Design a protein around this ligand. Sequence first.
Ligand SMILES: COc1ccc(C[C@@H]2NC(=O)/C=C\C[C@@H]([C@H](C)[C@H]3O[C@@H]3c3ccccc3)OC(=O)[C@H](CC(C)C)OC(=O)C(C)(C)CNC2=O)cc1Cl
Ligand SMILES: Nc1nc2c(ncn2[C@@H]2O[C@H](COP(=O)(O)OP(=O)(O)OP(=O)(O)O)[C@@H](O)[C@H]2O)c(=O)[nH]1
Ligand SMILES: Nc1nc2c(ncn2[C@@H]2O[C@H](COP(=O)(O)OP(=O)(O)O)[C@@H](O)[C@H]2O)c(=O)[nH]1
Lengths: 436, 430
Amino acid sequence: MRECISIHVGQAGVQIGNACWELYCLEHGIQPDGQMPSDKTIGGGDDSFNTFFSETGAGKHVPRAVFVDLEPTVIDEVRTGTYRQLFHPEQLITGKEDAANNYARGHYTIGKEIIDLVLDRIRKLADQCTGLQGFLVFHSFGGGTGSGFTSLLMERLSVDYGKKSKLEFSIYPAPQVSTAVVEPYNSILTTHTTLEHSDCAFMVDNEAIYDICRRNLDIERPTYTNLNRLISQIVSSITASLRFDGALNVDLTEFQTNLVPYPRIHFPLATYAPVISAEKAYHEQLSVAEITNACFEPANQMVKCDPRHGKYMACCLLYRGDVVPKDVNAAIATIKTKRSIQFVDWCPTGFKVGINYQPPTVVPGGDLAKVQRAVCMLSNTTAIAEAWARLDHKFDLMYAKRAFVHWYVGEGMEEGEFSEAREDMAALEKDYEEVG
Amino acid sequence: MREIVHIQAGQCGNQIGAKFWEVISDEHGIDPSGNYVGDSDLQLERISVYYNEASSHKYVPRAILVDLEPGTMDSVRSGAFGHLFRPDNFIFGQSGAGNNWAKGHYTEGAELVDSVLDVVRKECENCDCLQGFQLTHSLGGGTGSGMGTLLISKVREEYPDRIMNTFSVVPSPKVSDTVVEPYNATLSIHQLVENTDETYCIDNEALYDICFRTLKLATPTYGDLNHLVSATMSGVTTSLRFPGQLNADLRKLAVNMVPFPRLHFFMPGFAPLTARGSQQYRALTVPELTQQMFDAKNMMAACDPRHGRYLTVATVFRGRMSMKEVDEQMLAIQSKNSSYFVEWIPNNVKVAVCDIPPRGLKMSSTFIGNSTAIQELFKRISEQFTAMFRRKAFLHWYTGEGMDEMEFTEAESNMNDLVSEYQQYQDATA
Ligand SMILES: COc1ccc(C[C@@H]2NC(=O)/C=C\C[C@@H]([C@H](C)[C@H]3O[C@@H]3c3ccccc3)OC(=O)[C@H](CC(C)C)OC(=O)C(C)(C)CNC2=O)cc1Cl
Ligand SMILES: Nc1nc2c(ncn2[C@@H]2O[C@H](COP(=O)(O)OP(=O)(O)OP(=O)(O)O)[C@@H](O)[C@H]2O)c(=O)[nH]1
Ligand SMILES: Nc1nc2c(ncn2[C@@H]2O[C@H](COP(=O)(O)OP(=O)(O)O)[C@@H](O)[C@H]2O)c(=O)[nH]1
């Protein structure tokens, strides 16, 4: 009874979406030929899985998402991958030439000649909706397509739909899988023009995902199928709230309300704990108290920043299977050991919990195996300023001697944009640092 | 990607690029008859980068060869893989192109620029989208330097959007019969700095130095050095030719590499130095590749980078290889040489890995750097020019051919300013 639309931009976005949509199939029992025996095959739905699949009279359960790429190299792969028959006759978006690591080329030159088609597609999809909450866009700060076009898309959407919210999932690109060197300019130039049209954005750092996969997954060569699968698992876990059924954090509005205090501070940090290694059959057993104890370890968060230096806003949680709220209360009492915990004086505290009575789903033939309990703490820390400071150092270095600047100026951008965005990010990091 | 148009100028260009076509055509496993021999799709994933289908869906290289000395056509059609090309772009002159500028730059050649634009547009009609251009030439003689700069400017006018890349060969006193070279070299690089996007300094001085002091060949011929350069430029092209993780492209290579708006002269290098062999080889393994990648006597510019700084770096490794090991040694090399590299762009030393071995060697790589050491080469060329110029010499040829003294003076002003720019960016701080 509340529709939802997602959208994928860029190679990273489309790959993550590929890795996520089949997880989404698995979770509800949806299968490329599945039928979910409790339905009428004609709109049989309006449950929490209706928000994505707008199932047709053919009992197909077609989704609500489109994929964007300036030059077909991954969107084709999903067009001829595994769930081929799962998408409409050329509903997807294919271009002819990428922005090539150039924020400007996607922000002023190329996208400004393809965007109208994207908006037409988004509107045409939304018309079939009835109660849309907002958009969930997938992009990255690395390239110029998944960044310049994303910011331009933000502007266009906020122009056409300002009332509705639109949650974001982003990647803070790492030197380890750095496919460019002009990422930091794109990152600043995207965060600066994101705030005024953003509401709540999640960053998942490929530094962090790479570290997790290399360390606790026994993989030394993280292709774009390993890190991609891990991130898909995290995204499914976070959106399970609205996805499976009703509990804490039903709606995107509710995301904002219980997460974001201050519209300049809307980058929640997500932690996880169950990192099942591999097909390893037997290591030991597991306890809910154990995983909630682990969800405080700095090594197990989706973005590298040590929060024992700062204060939290609102530390929500989710769980899968084996309800035991008394154990949860004991867990809060234990973590109250105040060795690495804090809250903020002005507003009281709430560790809202919502339980899903389904054990977590796993990739069948992947680098994981099925477990029974799961949990994901979305702690809106003040420590998330570490990432911005780290990226500011590099942006300042590169802008010291005006490196690469021509590749942006000579395409429809001015010189003052760089300076003003740097100042704006300085104000933003000041706005984080002052809270306390 | 989109298609690439290749342009070949003069005797040096025709010979060097014909050998390069042979090298890659063996690498992509295509027969002289256009017959297909490759045994996997990974060979033809990016065959459309260069080669175009025939009426028999037979893949044909797309390139153009330009010169005015009409004796080159038979040289084209007498190589081992020479007859491979389309019998439509063997367009050449008819009365020689004596190594004088403004003869191919102003006097003639300017009459056949219509012909060359006609042929390049004709074969880019069959190109669904255009990526860039490959002009191979040298900095001495009309056909060569002068035609190259004229072509560069013309296509820059007609296609201001796409990329423009070229290979530069700088003639040297060590192997050079004529002596009107330094004038040609400076007159060339003046057009080249302001009119192209990136360029490779395939030098002869360093080439001869290393070939005679380690490879120790008696008579460096147009055979041996042609082989060396064809191999190295094949190695450079591999990254686009291969599918890579550092899945770089011409525009992407420019964006990643290009540090300033006038410093786009690269220093192609190669770690496992190779002569004309017969058997498989004497074996080489990883740490040897690591060391010989960045030695002092393996590049193509007579400079020691430890006397300068890198703006950026790039490599493309070859053969079955341990990626984690490679990353480990690269991290060490960026760790144990802190002062060696510029502090302006961290995360500059990019790395990629390829799979198909070179057709003859097991484990190799391809170094495509961008240093501040290139000022030594440019200073050398400019000093020899001005030594030839302080008193006039053959300059009556140029003046009566169309230039004036002011063009020479401004070419030197531009080159010395460029050297000042490289010096400046070579002495930055934090
Ligand atoms: C001080 O007196 C000296 C005299 C000679 C030498 C070395 C002497 N010099 C040169 O000519 C070198 C460059 C001058 C250019 C001049 C500057 C270009 O405009 C030329 C031109 C070409 C065609 C038509 C009109 C004009 O000429 C040439 O390249 C011509 C090629 C042509 C004529 C086939 O000749 C040769 O290429 C040679 C003679 C085989 C090359 N060899 C030499 O041992 C050294 C000194 Cl120091
Ligand atoms: N899918 C995926 N992408 C990643 C990962 N790590 C980094 N990336 C990013 O993937 C991006 C490639 O897509 P884009 O950023 O859109 O690249 P582009 O040059 O703008 O355009 P395309 O290459 O056509 O997509 C780079 O910016 C990388 O930083 C990863 O683990 N998975
Ligand atoms: N043919 C040839 N010439 C080379 C090579 N390397 C350097 N050169 C030099 O390039 C110059 C030849 O210029 P060229 O293109 O013949 O001028 P043109 O007479 O106008 O065609 C000579 O100085 C050669 O020494 C090579 O591999 N092949």
